[PDB]
Symmetry: C3
Amino acid sequence: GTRNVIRTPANNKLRMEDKRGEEHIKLSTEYGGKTQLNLGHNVDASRELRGEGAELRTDDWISIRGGKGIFISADMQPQAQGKMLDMDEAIRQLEQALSLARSMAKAATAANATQGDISCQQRLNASLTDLTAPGMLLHAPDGIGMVSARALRIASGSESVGIMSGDNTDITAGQSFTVVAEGAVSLLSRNQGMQLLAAKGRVNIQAQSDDLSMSSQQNLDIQSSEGKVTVSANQELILACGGAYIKLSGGNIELGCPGQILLK
Amino acid sequence: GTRNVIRTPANNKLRMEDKRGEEHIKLSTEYGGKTQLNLGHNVDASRELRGEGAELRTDDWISIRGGKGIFISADMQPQAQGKMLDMDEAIRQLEQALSLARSMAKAATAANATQGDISCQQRLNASLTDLTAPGMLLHAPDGIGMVSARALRIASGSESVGIMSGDNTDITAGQSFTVVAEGAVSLLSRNQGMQLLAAKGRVNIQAQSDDLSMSSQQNLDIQSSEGKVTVSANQELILACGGAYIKLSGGNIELGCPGQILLK
Amino acid sequence: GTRNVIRTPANNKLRMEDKRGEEHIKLSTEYGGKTQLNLGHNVDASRELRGEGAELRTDDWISIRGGKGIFISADMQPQAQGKMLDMDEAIRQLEQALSLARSMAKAATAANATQGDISCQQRLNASLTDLTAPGMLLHAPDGIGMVSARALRIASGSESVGIMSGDNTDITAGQSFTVVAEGAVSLLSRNQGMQLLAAKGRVNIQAQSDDLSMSSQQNLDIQSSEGKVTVSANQELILACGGAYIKLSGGNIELGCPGQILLK
């Protein structure tokens, strides 16, 4: 009743369940656990619903190989009406991310920050839009979670990794956040400033083989709240303001000013 | 022998291999290379094992479209016993990441760092848990690798990108690490301090239109090991410690202290 | 004509289209919208091409569960010639990312930066290579896009998140870039220096319970372009260069030098 089964003696089966409102197709082999494709109203052995939709499952490996590209999408396309690669919302996301990156790259240029790699991201947009190149596009309207107890790797071998967020980009490290860049490290805040804080542990800022420049347009405050402040130069220590200066150089101290030197 | 084949003249085939311990189902069309679904003990033309499990393969595009959400999981569910969306380990990962982010957000508040966006990550937990919203959940117990020779993009159009690690979060850039935030850039180390190091190249720290404050509770050391230290103010340069002060302002130098000024 | 259909009264169908050069297989159930597997030259109801390759689609959930690991790959394997888990290009990407991370870890050690977590990434390489452990490997030769209007999460519960780029790693936050590390925050630029810039907003650098050290090998410049520079110590303020020093401590000012003190 309402079950059409092509079953082999080895229990390779193609089962079609006809019960209206609970139709399903099961393509199942006994190898690798039950390696199965379950479509529709998927039930267990006791015919209780164990899931709705499409399940590709195995105890062994799963390989999904698309020579022209992979589109994995949580975007509803009811009744399969539309192209297989209909990705309008994913394309909107790609364009939004790219335009955000481009506007931020202009902002970085204006602030003399190191610009991002717009070229490879624009090329990625071209590649992934309609998957004209064999890329991979993962899109979900309600968020994507990539999780593992073990390590995760996101790696571009030859090009850039771009992370775009309309909101925050939050990194939470249970141990440490480390960046090694072969070229530059550039952090640009556009509106709300920058906080570089160690709740505990030493803060060490080094131009190990070059100049260090620390400037503000407005007031610059350097403070040790409970300890010492030591400023040491090897060649020359200069404090200058408004024509007045104090210079420590050679083995001399020079206090020069156009006005008066007052000792109180 | 042990091979049931529904083969069409165009070589559309549904093959069921019955050989015990090496059962497989092959659903194959000649279009797009061999566009195939291979289940179980998958063999090549010479009947040698080319893979175990489920293979969806084509020379053309692959589209995986789930209107209610996509669960891609390397979590063993032997004999398909359990719900199709049984995601207990993935849910544990989501909860662990969220609780880590929340505890770190409290820590950021305590340290006056810019807090992360907990709201969208909590909403993401709600969405992805059992895929109650059409999200995408990728979980593997032994790690996830997302790799390409070309560019990678991880982008949230309207919400936050959250990266959580029980261990380190390491970024290794073959060229440069650039951050442009529209709001704030906030780096908080909780226990082991902060190292901002340029092995080569200039270190430039600017509050381009605002105040810069650099403070330590303990000793603050500013040093040029081989060059000069220049401290310049536009309005007023003040060095103060213990009631003593040196002020460079106007065109004057003022050395004030309640004790003695000693020149040696 | 050229259409072999196993159709049930409930419209569970296995359709094989034999038209040469446009062959396709359709496995379709009416449940969950049209929950379907479409292989090959996939057409709509009016027999117009709606996509080429393999489509797994449903209005409900999609579950892809591989107990031994998931390989999702946009790597062409023409005519299914080769192993199901043939991942030579993906393995090259994994090795390239790992070797980049290792060389950068050595560089971080040389610069006294906090080293990254190479161990878990090396273990991830071992796990994902041929999927010897149940990991997940996503590889596309032409780039990977992971996008959502909603939040994204990349999380390792117990291990590290590694981001590797042959080129830049760009982060573009529409609101804020926040890092909370339980241990250290370490930014190492190898060649092109470091820019920590707030176009607007206060720059705040704090060793909240420890020492702060700011050093350059070459010239160190501290400047307020339009405001004041204030240097305050609690215990002792020392400016030293070439044997000369100015010390503010107790309530005293001491100017000591082996040469001469010149007031101009």
